[PDB]
Amino acid sequence: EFMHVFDNNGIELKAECSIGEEDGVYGLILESWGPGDRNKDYNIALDYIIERLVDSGVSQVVVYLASSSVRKHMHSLDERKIHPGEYFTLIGNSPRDIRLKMCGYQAYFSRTGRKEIPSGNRTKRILINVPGIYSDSFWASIIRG
DNA sequence: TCATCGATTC
DNA sequence: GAATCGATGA
């Protein structure tokens, strides 16, 4: 029922995802890692996604916190946007370093709202949007590799 | 049973 | 500072 991210050799990663419209935004949902081994390839998969997005000519995305807890308690979509600006930039560093920065922002969320000091898990359910992209074919080629 | 992120280990 | 574990409440 879930799709998955595949590595550069075409092997399926432990990283569930899905493509579609959620809360009015079209894009890729990456499921959370945990407990134990559930989606344990989250970071690897996310590095591949960033790398392939950059390769396809995408330089900026919008990323929203999409956990059940945050969707329930934070009704504003603008507040679920994990990064302070309108967009998050994918170029200017390695896919890994870009990912570290992207996921660092996830640590500013608790179950019920934002924190002052960031802490905790950084492998949460997230929605990634590429402005102007409304089609599953584009996202399909990103996760397929 | 289950996804949540705080807590612990790296 | 970040990867991984696993206690927790719905």
How many Å apart are A124 CA and C6 C1'? 16
Which two three-digit tokens encode residue A60? 């900026």
How many other C-beta atoms are found inside a 10 Å radius of the C-beta of residue A47?
Answer: 19
Smallest Cα–C1' distance to nucleotide C5: which residue has it? Answer: A36
DSSP helix/strand/coil, A27 = strand
Answer for the pair A66, A51: CB distance below 8 angstroms, yes or no. no
Q: How far apart are alpha carbons A129 and A38 in whole angstroms?
A: 24
DSSP helix/strand/coil, A130 = coil
Answer for the pair A66, A74: CB distance below 8 angstroms, yes or no. no
Q: How far apart are alpha carbons A82 and A108 in whole angstroms?
A: 8
Contacts of A89 (CB under 8 A, 6+ apart): A59, A60, A98
Domain boundaries along the sequence of chain A:
1-145
Single-letter amino acid code for the residue at A94: S
Smallest Cα–C1' distance to nucleotide C10: which residue has it? Answer: A69
Q: How many angstroms separate the Cα of A112 from the Cα of each of A10, A15, A24, A29, A101?
A: 38, 25, 21, 20, 22
Q: How far apart are alpha carbons A120 and A24 in whole angstroms?
A: 28
Q: How many angstroms separate the Cα of A104 from the Cα of each of A63, A75, A98, A120, A124?
A: 12, 22, 10, 10, 11
Q: How far apart are alpha carbons A130 and A128 in whole angstroms?
A: 7
**Strand C nucleotides within 7 Å of a protein CB:** 1-8
Count CA atoms closer than 13 A to A106's CA, side-chain side.
Answer: 22
The structure was resolved to a resolution in Å of: 2.1
Can you tell me which residue has the tokens 């074919």? A137
Asked if strand B contacts A141 at the CB level, meaning under 7 A, the answer is no
Single-letter amino acid code for the residue at A67: S
Q: How far apart are alpha carbons A52 and A57 in whole angstroms?
A: 9
The DSSP secondary-structure symbol of A141 reads H
Query: What is the experimental method?
Result: X-ray
The strands making up A25-30's β-sheet, listed across from edge to edge, are A3-6, A12-22, A25-30, A126-129, A60-65, A88-89
**Strand B nucleotides within 7 Å of a protein CB:** 3-7
